[PDB]
Ligand binder design. Structure first.
Ligand code: TSU
Ligand code: TSU
Ligand code: TSU
Length: 205
């Protein structure tokens, strides 16, 4: 009666605590073990059965045949910079094209969201200022620099540096990844795991 799973940062910050509280009421005899995990790194842990499932951004098409991918929702990606950033008031990606970026993690590699965003608008590649794979470190790094970055809106709202950050009110499109449940399709879904996932969906809305 154990559930071991991984959760992505957006999930970890809002949905997870509320979900675990609702779930402990409904299934009080289940022991939960939760860890950090993003796609692709969770893939072999799901594959070998160390994780029962993982809640993470991913793209349907990159995902091994072993895994099924139940979409839960679409992420809300924001561009974030220190509060007085020269580009704080920008509305178009072309206006950011000379800024330096903290490339943050994403399923297709560090900085993949903003590189793809710039590409889709026929812009040149965004300038690399630094690679920061740690969503825990990222808000404080951006707050102490003039680097821009992308992050889920939940992390922008829930970090200890939020009074020193701003979100860029972009009117151009950003390629928001979809948040999936990832699990071996050959693994039957226990009532408890299904219950916990439904709670994370319910609270993440
Ligand atoms: C770009 C991006 C990175 C990570 C996530 S998260 O997996 O929801 O925390 C969503 C969107
Ligand atoms: C925290 C931090 C990280 C990186 C830089 S920068 O490379 O000069 O933009 C400045 C400050
Ligand atoms: C509405 C909405 C959906 C998703 C997110 S996010 O998970 O923080 O990217 C924030 C807000």
């Amino acid at each position: 009666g154990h559930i071991t799973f991984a959760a992505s940062p957006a999930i970890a910050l809002a949905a997870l605590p509320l979900a675990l509280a609702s779930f402990a009421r409904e299934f009080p005899d289940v022991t939960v073990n939760v860890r950090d995990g993003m796609y692709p790194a969770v893939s072999p842990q799901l594959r070998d059965g160390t994780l029962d499932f993982a809640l993470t951004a991913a793209h349907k098409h990159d995902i091994d045949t072993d895994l099924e991918a139940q979409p839960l929702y679409v992420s809300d990606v924001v561009i974030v910079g220190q509060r007085q950033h020269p580009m704080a008031n920008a509305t178009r990606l072309a206006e950011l094209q000379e800024c330096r970026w903290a490339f943050s993690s994403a399923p297709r590699g560090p900085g993949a969201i903003i590189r793809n965003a710039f590409a889709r608008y026929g812009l040149p590649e965004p300038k690399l200022g630094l690679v920061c794979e740690s969503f825990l470190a990222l808000p404080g790094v951006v707050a102490h620099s003039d680097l821009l970055t992308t992050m889920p809106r939940t992390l922008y709202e829930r970090n200890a540096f939020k009074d020193q950050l701003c979100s860029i009110p972009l009117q151009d499109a950003l390629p928001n990844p979809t948040i999936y449940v990832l699990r071996r399709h050959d693994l039957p879904v226990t009532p408890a795991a299904a219950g916990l996932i439904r709670w994370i969906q319910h609270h993440a809305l």
